[PDB]
């Protein structure tokens, strides 16, 4: 049965609620982005209207084979009427096609559902600025002060410098990058660009990337592993066993692997700086874990919410335990007292 935090009061609407069957009294199902915990339950046998971004709509059709007639893409930053209710989709700064949704209820209330997001000061100059928000459905993934990580720009700098140094010292080194969903494409694209290579990958991952409206994508990626010196592999294979096996497959073309695992947060972040990060090494293989996040840090989340000044906050992440719930409510109260709303 669908939880309260996926229901939008005063509407026939749900958000990211596809694993509950036919929800009683839902006329439109919104989908914030193409991640499996969020789309869980959609399939080619869905016959209700799905509202989403253009990019999410490419993935639903091409990867899940949802039929076209049920796919309702909307432009961003544009006032749209759905089943008689004004809505706006905003860029969520998460993965490609990820949105936040503003609902303007018939009774005068305004609600923002963040989906998954990485808060940024640029959001303070979208259509959010223009009016007041009564209720906030917030991505609280990293809602605790210990969660610090660097900017995406600093992390990509580190990865580009690291890769270019290694391959310039050894032209026979291969760079491998792990992936398990869409998101974080800048990691492997930035490294390939500095090396003047295309990125090689499976046909299934190549297909996925073709749905994302990345400009000039044909100039950047390929299914020919031989012609490429940056390879993508499933995240599960990013370990000494899995990478040894892959090196076997390259026909003596390479004698060293340098690999990147973009993780979320990892406790090494509490004591160490990005400049200081070191790999795990075994023989001719080195693995770097790099904290490339597509969710808000604690400080970014706080700044966003203090700016928005919502009347009520409903967390959508870490809600399963009383201790988590109570911890989050404490921080929301500090924020409101510190800022004065
Ligand atoms: Ni997500």
CATH number at residue 313: 3.60.15.10
Could you tell me if 64 and 107 lie in one domain?
yes
Distance 116 CA to ligand 1 centre (A): 5
Distance 113 CA to ligand 1 centre (A): 13
Could you tell me if 131 and 173 lie in one domain?
no
| Number of domains into which the chain is organized | 2
Could you tell me if 7 and 69 lie in one domain?
yes
Q: Are 205 and 223 in contact, with CB atoms under 8 Å apart?
A: no
Could you tell me if 140 and 154 lie in one domain?
no
Query: Regarding beta strands 280-282 and 110-113, do their DSSP bridges make them parallel or antiparallel, or are they unpaired?
Result: unpaired
Angle between helices 298-308 and 322-339 (to 10 degrees): 50
Could you tell me if 133 and 160 lie in one domain?
no
Distance 8 CA to ligand 1 centre (A): 20
Distance 35 CA to ligand 1 centre (A): 5
Look up residue 217 and give its two tokens: 């994508």
Sort residue 310 into left (φ over 0), alpha (ψ -120 to 50) or beta.
beta
Distance between CA 170 and CA 255 in Å, rounded? 9
Distance 81 CA to ligand 1 centre (A): 26
* CATH value at residue 230: 3.40.50.12650
Distance 123 CA to ligand 1 centre (A): 18
Of 277, 295, 313, which marks where a domain is finished? 295
Distance 191 CA to ligand 1 centre (A): 23
Could you tell me if 133 and 161 lie in one domain?
no
Distance 275 CA to ligand 1 centre (A): 27
Distance 333 CA to ligand 1 centre (A): 26
Of 274, 295, 316, which marks where a domain is finished? 295
Rg of the chain on CA atoms, in Å? 22
Distance 179 CA to ligand 1 centre (A): 14
Q: Count CB-CB contacts under 10 A for residue 260.
A: 26
Query: Regarding beta strands 13-15 and 7-8, do their DSSP bridges make them parallel or antiparallel, or are they unpaired?
Result: antiparallel
Distance 117 CA to ligand 1 centre (A): 8
Distance 260 CA to ligand 1 centre (A): 20
Method used experimentally: X-ray
Distance 236 CA to ligand 1 centre (A): 18
Distance between CA 27 and CA 36 in Å, rounded? 22
Distance 172 CA to ligand 1 centre (A): 36
Distance 251 CA to ligand 1 centre (A): 37
Q: Count CB-CB contacts under 10 A for residue 151.
A: 13
Strands (E) across the chain are located at 7-8, 13-15, 28-30, 50-52, 71-73, 80-82, 85-91, 99-104, 110-113, 135-138, 173-179, 199-200, 221-222, 230-234, 256-263, 280-282, 285-291, 312-315
Q: How far is CA 287 from CA 140, 186, 256, in A?
A: 29, 18, 11
What are residue 173's phi and psi, to 5 degrees? -85, 145
Q: 131 burial class (0-12, 13-18, 19+ CB within 10 angstroms)?
A: exposed
Distance 107 CA to ligand 1 centre (A): 31
Could you tell me if 196 and 70 lie in one domain?
no
Distance 33 CA to ligand 1 centre (A): 7
Could you tell me if 283 and 157 lie in one domain?
yes
Look up residue 212 and give its two tokens: 């994302």
Distance between CA 180 and CA 279 in Å, rounded? 21
Distance 241 CA to ligand 1 centre (A): 29
Could you tell me if 265 and 333 lie in one domain?
no
- Of 208, 220, 264, which Cα lies nearest the Cα of 96? 208
Could you tell me if 55 and 127 lie in one domain?
yes
Could you tell me if 254 and 310 lie in one domain?
no
Beta bridge partners of 314: 137
Distance 94 CA to ligand 1 centre (A): 7
Q: Containing domain of residue 213, as a range? A: 148-295
Distance 295 CA to ligand 1 centre (A): 8
Could you tell me if 122 and 65 lie in one domain?
yes
Distance 40 CA to ligand 1 centre (A): 12
Distance between CA 183 and CA 170 in Å, rounded? 30
Distance 196 CA to ligand 1 centre (A): 30
Distance 256 CA to ligand 1 centre (A): 33
The 3-state DSSP class for residue 288 equals strand
């Amino acid at each position: 049965t669908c939880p309260f935090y996926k229901k939008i009061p005063g509407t026939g609407f749900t958000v990211d609620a596809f694993q509950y069957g036919v929800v009683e009294g839902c006329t439109a199902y919104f989908l914030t982005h193409f991640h499996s915990d969020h789309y869980a339950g959609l399939s080619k046998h869905f016959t209700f209207p799905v509202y989403c971004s253009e990019i999410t709509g490419n993935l639903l059709k091409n990867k899940l084979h949802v039929q076209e007639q049920y796919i309702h893409p909307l432009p961003l930053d544009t006032e749209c009427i759905v089943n008689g209710v004004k809505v706006v989709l905003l860029d969520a700064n998460h993965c490609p096609g990820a949105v936040m949704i503003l609902f303007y209820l018939p009774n005068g209330t305004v609600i923002l559902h963040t989906g998954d997001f990485r808060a940024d000061p640029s959001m303070e100059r979208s259509l959010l600025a223009d009016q007041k928000v009564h209720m906030l459905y917030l991505d609280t993934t990293y809602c605790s002060p210990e969660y610090t990580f660097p900017s995406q720009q600093e992390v990509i700098r580190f990865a580009i410098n690291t890769a270019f140094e290694a391959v310039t010292l050894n032209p026979h080194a291969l760079v491998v990058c792990g992936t398990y969903s869409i998101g974080k494409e800048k990691v492997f694209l930035a490294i390939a660009d500095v090396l003047g290579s295309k990125v090689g990958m499976s046909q299934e991952k190549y297909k996925t990337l073709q749905c994302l409206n990345i400009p000039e994508i044909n100039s950047l990626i390929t299914t020919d592993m031989c012609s490429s010196l940056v390879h993508l592999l499933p995240m599960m294979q990013i370990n000494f066993k899995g990478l040894q096996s892959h090196l076997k497959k390259c026909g003596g073309k390479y004698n060293q692997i340098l690999a990147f695992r973009p993780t979320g947060w990892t406790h090494s972040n509490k004591f160490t700086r990005i400049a200081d990060v070191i790999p795990q090494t075994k023989g001719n293989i080195s693995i770097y874990g790099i904290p490339y996040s597509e969710h808000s840090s604690y400080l970014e989340m706080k700044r966003f919410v203090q700016w928005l000044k919502p009347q009520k906050i409903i967390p959508t992440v870490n809600v399963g335990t009383w201790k988590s719930r109570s911890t989050m409510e404490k921080y929301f109260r500090e924020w409101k007292l510190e800022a004065g709303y």
